[PDB]
Amino acid sequence: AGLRKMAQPSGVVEKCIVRVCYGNMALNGLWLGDTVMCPRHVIASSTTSTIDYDYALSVLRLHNFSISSGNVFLGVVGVTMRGALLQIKVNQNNVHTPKYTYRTVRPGESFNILACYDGAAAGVYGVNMRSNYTIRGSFINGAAGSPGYNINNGTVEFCYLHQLELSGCHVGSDLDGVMYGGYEDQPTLQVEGASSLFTENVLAFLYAALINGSTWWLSSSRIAVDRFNEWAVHNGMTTVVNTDCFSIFAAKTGVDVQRLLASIQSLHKNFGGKQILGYTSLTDEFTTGEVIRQMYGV
């Protein structure tokens, strides 16, 4: 019994973190094979004005990099721009490189953050990409380059390298260097889009609550998906587009999605009056996949 936001084990990723220093700047890099990937703001020679990264790269000198894995220093062979990242070719192959892929995550998907400082892992926690392409993280200065990952059947899927903070609102790029949400890797006046609760994840959470014996919040009324969606976009929640994933839950619990949607509308009106499994009534950080694993081990 129980439900907790957890991270997949971090051992296979810990051996891939390096410290990347240039000039007065230091952050983290991801060392796979003979390449280190890191945010390109490490070569910026500024702290307020707007940065021409192509110029910064044109004036760069390779011997000014200090890249280290613990107390082992890596020689730099070359640098190439990869969107909001640098691809730094080094003279040593990482013998601990896992089998890995890159994937760009979509709103509502869960992954794992390995929070790093000074080229060493410090903490690990699960996160969920929000509709405005930010994550609810915990990062302070020096965490840039911290990787986000999932582990699927022996393979590490890298989906995030930390870049910047907009108020507990964090933004990164995927490993192709595309910034999530289109935010610039520049210290500019940009504001995040409106955060909305990811409804399909709320539905997973409420099914999890039903399976763990929490029912006080369950409405006896019912609302169709397309009517709920009309209401959702005027009330800070996303639209429901897939429901086939809930068929197993509706069968195990005897409660269909339309009753859960009506329950969500009622929770949005006595919001905060009572917790669900010790959580905020409308938490959206759990996916159906996460719930199935914790409930049933599958």
């Binding site: 703001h41 910026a44 380059g145 903070e165 006046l189």
Partner: peptide, 5 residues
Amino acid sequence: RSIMQ
């Protein structure tokens, strides 16, 4: 806005 580099 605030880079964490």
